[PDB]
Symmetry: C3
Subunit: 536 residues, 3 copies
Amino acid sequence: PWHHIENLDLFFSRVYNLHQKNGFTCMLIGEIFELMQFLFVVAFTTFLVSCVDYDILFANKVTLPDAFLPAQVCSARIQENGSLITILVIAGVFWIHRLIKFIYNICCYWEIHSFYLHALRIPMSALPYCTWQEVQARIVQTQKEHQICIHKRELTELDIYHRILRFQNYMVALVNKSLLPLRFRLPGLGEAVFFTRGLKYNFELILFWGPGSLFLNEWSLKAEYKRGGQRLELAQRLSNRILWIGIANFLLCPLILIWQILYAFFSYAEVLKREPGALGARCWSLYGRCYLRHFNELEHELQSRLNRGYKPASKYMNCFLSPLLTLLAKNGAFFAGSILAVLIALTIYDEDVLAVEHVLTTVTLLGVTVTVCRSFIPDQHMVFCPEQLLRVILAHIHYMPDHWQGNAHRSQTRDEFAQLFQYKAVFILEELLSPIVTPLILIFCLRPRALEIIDFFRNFTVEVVGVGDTCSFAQMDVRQHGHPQWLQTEASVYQQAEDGKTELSLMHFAITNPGWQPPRESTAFLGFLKEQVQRD
Amino acid sequence: PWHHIENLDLFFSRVYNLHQKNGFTCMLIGEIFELMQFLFVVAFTTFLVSCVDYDILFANKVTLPDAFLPAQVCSARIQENGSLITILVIAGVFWIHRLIKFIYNICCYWEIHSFYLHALRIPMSALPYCTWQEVQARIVQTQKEHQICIHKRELTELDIYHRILRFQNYMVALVNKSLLPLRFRLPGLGEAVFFTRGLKYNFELILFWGPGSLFLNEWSLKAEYKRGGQRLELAQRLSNRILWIGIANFLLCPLILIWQILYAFFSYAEVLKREPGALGARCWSLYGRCYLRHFNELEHELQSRLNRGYKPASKYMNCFLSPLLTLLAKNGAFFAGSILAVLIALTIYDEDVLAVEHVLTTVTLLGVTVTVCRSFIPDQHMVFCPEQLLRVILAHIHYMPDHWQGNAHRSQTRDEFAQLFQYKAVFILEELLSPIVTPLILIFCLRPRALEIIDFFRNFTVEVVGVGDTCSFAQMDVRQHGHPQWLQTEASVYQQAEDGKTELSLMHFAITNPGWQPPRESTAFLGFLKEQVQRD
Amino acid sequence: PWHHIENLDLFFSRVYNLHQKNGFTCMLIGEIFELMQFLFVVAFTTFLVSCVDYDILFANKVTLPDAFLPAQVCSARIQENGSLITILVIAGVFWIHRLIKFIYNICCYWEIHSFYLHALRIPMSALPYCTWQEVQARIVQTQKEHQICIHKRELTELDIYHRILRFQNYMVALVNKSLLPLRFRLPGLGEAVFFTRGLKYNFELILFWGPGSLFLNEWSLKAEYKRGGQRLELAQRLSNRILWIGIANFLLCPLILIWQILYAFFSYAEVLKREPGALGARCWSLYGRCYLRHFNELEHELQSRLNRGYKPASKYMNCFLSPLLTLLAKNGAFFAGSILAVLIALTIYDEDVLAVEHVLTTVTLLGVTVTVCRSFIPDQHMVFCPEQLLRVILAHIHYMPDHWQGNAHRSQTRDEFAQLFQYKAVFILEELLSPIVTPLILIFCLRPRALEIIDFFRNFTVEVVGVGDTCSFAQMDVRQHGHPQWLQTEASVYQQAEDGKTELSLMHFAITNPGWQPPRESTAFLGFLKEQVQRD
Ligand SMILES: CCCCCCCCCCC(CCCCCCCCCC)(CO[C@H]1O[C@@H](CO)[C@H](O[C@@H]2O[C@@H](CO)[C@H](O)[C@@H](O)[C@@H]2O)[C@@H](O)[C@@H]1O)CO[C@H]1O[C@@H](CO)[C@H](O[C@@H]2O[C@@H](CO)[C@H](O)[C@@H](O)[C@@H]2O)[C@@H](O)[C@H]1O
Ligand SMILES: CCCCCCCCCCC(CCCCCCCCCC)(CO[C@H]1O[C@@H](CO)[C@H](O[C@@H]2O[C@@H](CO)[C@H](O)[C@@H](O)[C@@H]2O)[C@@H](O)[C@@H]1O)CO[C@H]1O[C@@H](CO)[C@H](O[C@@H]2O[C@@H](CO)[C@H](O)[C@@H](O)[C@@H]2O)[C@@H](O)[C@H]1O
Ligand SMILES: CCCCCCCCCCC(CCCCCCCCCC)(CO[C@H]1O[C@@H](CO)[C@H](O[C@@H]2O[C@@H](CO)[C@H](O)[C@@H](O)[C@@H]2O)[C@@H](O)[C@@H]1O)CO[C@H]1O[C@@H](CO)[C@H](O[C@@H]2O[C@@H](CO)[C@H](O)[C@@H](O)[C@@H]2O)[C@@H](O)[C@H]1O
Ligand SMILES: CCCCCCCCCCC(CCCCCCCCCC)(CO[C@H]1O[C@@H](CO)[C@H](O[C@@H]2O[C@@H](CO)[C@H](O)[C@@H](O)[C@@H]2O)[C@@H](O)[C@@H]1O)CO[C@H]1O[C@@H](CO)[C@H](O[C@@H]2O[C@@H](CO)[C@H](O)[C@@H](O)[C@@H]2O)[C@@H](O)[C@H]1O
Ligand SMILES: CCCCCCCCCCC(CCCCCCCCCC)(CO[C@H]1O[C@@H](CO)[C@H](O[C@@H]2O[C@@H](CO)[C@H](O)[C@@H](O)[C@@H]2O)[C@@H](O)[C@@H]1O)CO[C@H]1O[C@@H](CO)[C@H](O[C@@H]2O[C@@H](CO)[C@H](O)[C@@H](O)[C@@H]2O)[C@@H](O)[C@H]1O
Ligand SMILES: CCCCCCCCCCC(CCCCCCCCCC)(CO[C@H]1O[C@@H](CO)[C@H](O[C@@H]2O[C@@H](CO)[C@H](O)[C@@H](O)[C@@H]2O)[C@@H](O)[C@@H]1O)CO[C@H]1O[C@@H](CO)[C@H](O[C@@H]2O[C@@H](CO)[C@H](O)[C@@H](O)[C@@H]2O)[C@@H](O)[C@H]1O
């Protein structure tokens, strides 16, 4: 609760994170569990590889520990493996770095916990039931007593938003203006979108937080990037920086590939054996979390919007069925159910139809076949309405390409709605492929864009008095960043928010935070909008 | 895409069918699968009857093909069966007729495929996502360039409807005016309705397409039926025709009975072993598909209406529970679950309670008993609302007897809503009974109505300039076929659409096809209706 | 259908009960089943205790009846048990009393059956589909012909309500004004509510129907309780009466405890073995059936309101999840699914991984663990809205504390909504604990309130001309029993309906029974309410 604290972006971010992971104790436990999962994957894997005698386990009454070798021998058997010892040393160094960051993080989170209890007065018991809106209103009222925000002003409830979301507004504006290569033209497929967790991590490590990034403070852009001249040498320097970060990625490829595979296998294989159709359900697509996101939108508001609108979207995606697969399913079900009905009537009649060379395996395989086909057979009496489903999905989601509203029922619309909605299986596949795909996209597809990235960060970076250097769009300025088709805008092409992000983002903010005082242009815009809504 | 083609009814029907079975390839495959199902049922059955040595299979390690007899012996064993060889010869003749019709059909469908691609310009890829409305608008715009409709006029979008649905409007009007015996008074039951697939096939074979039917062209009624005189000799001729068609049915009874038995056995026996309650779900009742159908309503519009309104109807049917069966279920569940809980506690305690003469079979039978009873026990906390359920079911369905709206909750209403909604099990039973029941209804209950059928076809058959001879009701003429209670109508009794079919059918058509230009009386009617709706 | 019958409260109650248990036959069967369940529990239990030779059954091919001992020995083995014979004699005396009451009840119900058939003219076939509203309208029209209601007036449709619900309105008003101890302050828990079936039975046996109750006739209060004086001696007499009834409860404690144990064991043990999560579903809480109930509300109207509003309430209760349990579930699922995926991959690879000392039991236990955790893991994409859920729950339920409407999302609101909504498991536990808890609450917590109970029954008991002595609140008088905050009321504190029961109860009655003629003040109140609703 200190006066003139430190970097305020971090303080506010930590406060927000403490509200999200409901309380200090919960958060501490969550982090500890996160550290134990890594160590368990690595140690379980190295135990399975190195200490277990599979031959005795398989064939050659045997108790479980009859397989395991004694530690006095496991240590020697794992030590005489240069590749394994090297992977373990790199894994242990990453782990120790993560454990040290965790200790430092909890030592800094006890300070936020004391902030809550003593200056906000929200006990950790009343924190899960507490409405981040109420939390930040407490903070804004506290700004008087326990002084913060070194010496600029009183907090204005959007400052906190800018502090928590400075780099995320930059990502939103980068992806919104089609920098940052995502679309690819694969042979044998349409234009794929490849945006993963590792790729966005690399983009942020290149642009925002690193040794030689664009930013020096975490709230101020380096002084040269604001200068119009010397843009070409800056572009060359950025290109070399991203080249070498891509090469580090290419060299770390084997280790991250191993991690993604062990790890994929340690959860999704269980789910596969249980319910193989859980991976046929669809998830909201990291590209799509960044596309459908308003500018100053905290994570919980985006996710509330995203799951309010999830079941409409599943009803839409299941409308759409291929006739050929449906017919193949129907008829395979007929023929398999016929042979199975005959074999079942026989095994019921005499009961010795069973234990005939292949009858039992045949019954089981035929049952699996009938079940798969019946899962592919659409439910008769299914209401097919892709227009109203798309209308309600939009009402929850707020952003959609413009060539969707008319032709809701075509393959073009369905095909690029799957850009946003994504079978979970292609998610797991796409997270597996990112170790081997991220370096080459990073080296080849982004380095040509470095001169456009430099011009973005020079052109769209405003200095706001209290917060520092923020994105130019996240101001929610209807002027200078509007879009003439949605709407007064003093914005030409290249200087405009594409899918209506400025207008819809300002509306979403004004609706979610009713306490905020809207500037002149924003107030006039919202008033004219309300007049048009109530009039028309 | 030819000029002055052929019979246009067939051309249009084929075009519509090609749109429905989404594309030529899909349709071809579907027909091939339809041909392979027949051949598989017959060949699998004759293999099970004739080639398999059940004794060795049952009792007397044995591989599966140890049962089968060698073909050099299967041929002789199937050939020395006069009944089997005769059934196989009749089956093979029906098959060859169906295969020849299939070859002719695909040779005629390649012409419709070329029509699409070259004159409509809708590739087979864009056809599943294509909206029959858009397809027929293409057709109506094409009528200028690739000339069709030999020489009468330009197409008016209702001509295509009449062409595709000429005989189906006749069936709708026949069933609507209570010709065509459907209601029967069985002893021990209420008035049953027996309308099947085979019965309607026989009605159409008698009336519409045959050697000596009412129609000579497929678009023109024979010349004598338009004459008022000689009605009695025509009635006698029709009565003799239907007598001999009924006798052909009675003679073919054994073969169609065998077909229905086998074919139901295969599929529904599999479903029975899987989920015996799937046959307790209810389907929309061939009588009911013809009762709830508007006049000029293509199959996909009826089915869209029928499944939009399916779940309300299931919620209605499950409201209604017999108290005696509910009480018997509750108490049988109590006593069975009590004995099973005791036996389960014992088998858990010692684990040797099992392998006691009858304990395991008792546990299994008691589990089945508890599950059946719990399925019959209504869900407590079930909202019982048969008035609003009937209101929404009507909103989807549009046609309901008039003595339903008040007493939605009685046994009279539920009992004759099951005329339309029909357990799937009574559907399979009613399709099994049709081989043995259709000849006797056809000989006894319809031959007395022949003089009324002749008067129907003489009185209600208009000659419309472009289309030929169509039903008089399907014109959707508010005059001369109205109903005074629904509504100006110059229609007395016997000359009126009963359940409001004219008014509601004209409204449904005007709503589904917004491009159609409504005649004077229809326009005035729809305008007055809109004024009354917006006023009241 | 007799003229000047008997006590009319009983006649009307019986008529209502006959309508509820749909018909005489159904009702008779239900009662017979109720008698057979008691006898079966007792006889099955005494057979399991006394006649079965568990040693031979467990260890020492054996047919089931090899366990049972011959009756010539079972009689002697059950007779030489003083405790068992005593429990059986008390059980048989209670049974014989119940059988005698059943015979008398059906001999009195044949009279109501003849009443229906001959004076109301509703056959038992048309009775399940018959709408108690229609039944009582028949009754009110019958009041002219088959004369009833000895000589006061014609029936006014609220008289029947008072007759059926005289003592239940008293319970509603007792619980509504916080007499009748329900809230308790347990250590280690919040303020528990303990209101069971046995406790309310004891309250009614003390107050309403007994040897020396408050009422002498069933429709008239004893003459002394109307007198202001002698209140202290009446309070002492009531205190002694409730002391001795509590002591009878304390002495009968072992037998009712045995009954509850057995009876819960049978049914809920079966359900436990089947679906252990059925006991995690929530039920509407005997306290809560009495709290949410309007004054003159028959049982079926309350239950219709209670299940119309059940699924909203379950959606509310499940949008509250503890973060710590959710995190523990997620991570236990991870670690268990990881070890199980490894063991499953091994058993798939070689198939002899199985039959290794503990692998199969480990796979089963791990599967149970993963399933339990996945049940505790909240469904991602779950819409969390406790404000609109509470709004719709209120719309169905009509009564709620006033400090709920604002903070729908807190632990205070959830914690005292579980007062009304109650896991089924705590219901079964709370019905088990009532034999041992009811005597001590009855002796200690209610005897101090006897002087307030006397003042309640003296102050709030009006003599209405046709019905006799009814509760003062159940008149639905907006004056003299209103509440100034809801609303003209001439009611001070202690003389007012707390949660708005008078106003909302009068509204519910006027809406459910549209035929009733509302008195002056009630009519003016309802009119002003309608004017305010349509105005604001
Ligand atoms: C110049 C060099 C550049 C090279 C850079 C490489 C970039 C890619 C590296 C990827 C990696 C390196 C680890 C490799 C280990 C090697 C050891 C050898 C192993 C041999 C045996 C770190 O990278 C992750 O780090 C995260 C931050 O830690 C980032 O998100 C930040 O996180 C927060 C901040 O605390 C804030 O929310 C915010 O700041 C960011 O959102 C991620 O964006 C990033 O992918 C892997 O860590 C990852 O593990 C995966 C599960 O595989 C985790 O999955 C997630 O959570 C699971 C449930 O828990 C679910 O299962 C899974 O569905 C879910 O998705 C990831 O979350 C991540 O933890
Ligand atoms: C040739 C030079 C190369 C040297 C190594 C650098 C390699 C490049 C990355 C280095 C990297 C991890 C390694 C990447 C993971 C690899 C995955 C696979 C690897 C194994 C397969 C270590 O990060 C720091 O580690 C420090 C030591 O631990 C180093 O000491 C330095 O010197 C000392 C004195 O001068 C200083 O006192 C000391 O403070 C310095 O830090 C630093 O050099 C380094 O920057 C960066 O990761 C991390 O960056 C941070 C922001 O920084 C990210 O911030 C998160 O999100 C932001 C929200 O907006 C906010 O930032 C923040 O709210 C949030 O927490 C994290 O999400 C996190 O991901
Ligand atoms: C003077 C003499 C009069 C005698 C007339 C008899 C009238 C009754 C005969 C009935 C029969 C004779 C076959 C007997 C074989 C004997 C061989 C011996 C066997 C010994 C071993 C033909 O009759 C059917 O023919 C159809 C046309 O082919 C008709 O519909 C037309 O169809 C289209 C046009 O192509 C157009 O849509 C339109 O024009 C009509 O809608 C049907 O109405 C008619 O029932 C049987 O065929 C039938 O098989 C059944 C499944 O049993 C099929 O079931 C349907 O599809 C299944 C999924 O695929 C499902 O399982 C099933 O749920 C579903 O219901 C039927 O569809 C039908 O194919
Ligand atoms: C004592 C005389 C008796 C002779 C036999 C006739 C027996 C009566 C029916 C004969 C029957 C099948 C047999 C019934 C099935 C039996 C089931 C059980 C049987 C085994 C247990 C064969 O139909 C034709 O077969 C031809 C040869 O294959 C014959 O050759 C003739 O002579 C040549 C030169 O003069 C000519 O060139 C040749 O074109 C002639 O056809 C014809 O006689 C016969 O009409 C009719 O079935 C079929 O009728 C057609 C419309 O016709 C129905 O149309 C469908 O729906 C309509 C949509 O609106 C439209 O029509 C159409 O869009 C659609 O496709 C079909 O749904 C279909 O069902
Ligand atoms: C001075 C002395 C005072 C002492 C008073 C004690 C007060 C508590 C006694 C409790 C007891 C004494 C029996 C003990 C047997 C001892 C024999 C020895 C056994 C050794 C081996 C009678 O008490 C019950 O009697 C009922 C009336 O009969 C009362 O409700 C009235 O009922 C109607 C009127 O007919 C009218 O609706 C109305 O008037 C009241 O609503 C109940 O409120 C009362 O609890 C037990 O009876 C009970 O059995 C339980 C199931 O355990 C029954 O459960 C219910 O139905 C089940 C499905 O059927 C379900 O499973 C269960 O979920 C459900 O809850 C109860 O319903 C009840 O029948
Ligand atoms: C030291 C004296 C003690 C003597 C014994 C009395 C003990 C106290 C209760 C006695 C009790 C059962 C015992 C309690 C259960 C115990 C559970 C565990 C026990 C074993 C562990 C027997 O009830 C009666 O039984 C009679 C004989 O069978 C007795 O004969 C008497 O003398 C004769 C000539 O003068 C008379 O002709 C004869 O008519 C007298 O009845 C009476 O004394 C007794 O009142 C009362 O239970 C019952 O009360 C009735 C209303 O009364 C309740 O009414 C129900 O709900 C009401 C709706 O608003 C309405 O009333 C009604 O619509 C409905 O039906 C019932 O729900 C029911 O529960």
